[PDB]
């Protein structure tokens, strides 16, 4: 048996390439060269070495560069920045997937580690997205925009939606990452909003107008779910909507002042 420093020489070029893609100047880099390089790495029984080196080389950029802008954008076009980061990160990681395809086949399926694109999004998930200050500031920022939208403010629904899609794909095959960070906080937040409004309009008009608003609100919120949130959120919000506006106020609606199902 024997070992060579030669492994590093290709590794550096493979590493050197990955940075340049992330630098957004592909001119000069060639796919044909890189795939064979990656092929050589996995072929010489260095999959684990190649697999680790991947994890680092992407990770450093996200924490050293990507996170820094997101922190710098906390109070200047934040949503625009975080989306932009994940758009570019998507661009880079497909290349990473395309350059590592062989490793994506032999080592991944043999050793049961997560595949290249799973790692690409996961590190973007653990290290920038779900990072505390960004994570909470992200959640708060979106919730700030939605409520103001509920307050008649013209708002870039697409910006919110895009982030919602961003989170959805970040969850891999499950909704959880979307549920943990946005949905569950959203649903319960709306319950307080729904709860407050319900008693507000009960003191402003009778059953029929109260019903008219409730049905319109039911349609209104669902429409926002269609055009501003993920479409998978609909049923969750409806159960909350029904429980707060209707289920909590059943006996009242039957017996409104000089009105109600009795009248």
């Amino acid at each position: 048996t024997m070992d060579e420093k030669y492994v590093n020489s290709i590794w550096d070029l493979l590493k050197n390439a990955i940075q340049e893609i992330q630098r957004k100047n592909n001119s000069g880099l060639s796919f044909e060269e890189l795939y064979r390089n990656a092929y050589t790495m996995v072929l010489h029984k260095h999959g684990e070495k190649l697999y680790t080196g991947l994890r680092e080389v992407v990770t450093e950029h996200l924490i050293n560069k990507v996170r820094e802008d997101v922190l710098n954008s906390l109070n200047n076009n934040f949503l625009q920045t975080l989306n932009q980061a994940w758009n570019d990160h998507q661009t880079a990681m497909v290349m990473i997937r395309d350059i590592l395809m062989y490793m994506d086949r032999v080592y991944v399926q043999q050793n049961n580690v997560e595949n290249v694109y799973n790692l690409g999004l996961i590190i973007f998930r653990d290290q920038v997205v779900r990072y505390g200050c960004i994570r909470d500031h992200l959640r708060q920022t979106l919730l700030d925009m939605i409520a103001r939208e509920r307050k008649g403010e013209v708002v870039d629904r697409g910006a919110i939606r895009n982030a919602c899609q961003m989170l959805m794909i970040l969850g891999l095959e499950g909704r959880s990452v979307y549920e943990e960070d946005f949905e569950a906080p959203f649903l319960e937040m709306s319950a307080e909003f729904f709860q407050m409004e319900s008693q507000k309009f009960l003191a402003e008009n009778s059953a029929s107008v109260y019903i008219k608003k409730v049905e319109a609100r039911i349609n209104e919120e669902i429409e926002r779910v269609m055009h501003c949130l993920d479409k998978s959120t609909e049923e969750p919000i409806v159960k909350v909507v029904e429980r707060e506006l209707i289920s909590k106020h059943m006996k009242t609606i039957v017996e409104m002042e000089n009105s109600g199902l009795v009248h």
């Binding site: 001119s27 796919f31 044909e32 060269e33 795939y35 290349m95 395809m101 062989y102 086949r105």
Partner: protein, 114 residues
Amino acid sequence: GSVSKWVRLNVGGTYFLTTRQTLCRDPKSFLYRLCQADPDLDSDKDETGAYLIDRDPTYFGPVLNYLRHGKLVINKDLAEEGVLEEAEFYNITSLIKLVKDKIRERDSKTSQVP
């Protein structure tokens, strides 16, 4: 359309001509990535426009024809063990499978006990 449907693979110095849809039998294939107009291909090009590929030009025959008519064409002299490791590089997963059996198939008669 500023684009063509026929590509020139300069594999191993040899010029193989083939049409885009021919290479897309396995989208997870190395070639399928070559088949696109992605932002990571322009470098690998010849003065003619042929894509410069750096693997064996002779064992490539079975690989490319399989992408044409989904069957292995092993010129009798070639060694089954040789295309396999050319198949592996191109990432034709299904093709990798049937050659391996062919390798196993050969031993049925060659590794036999009379």
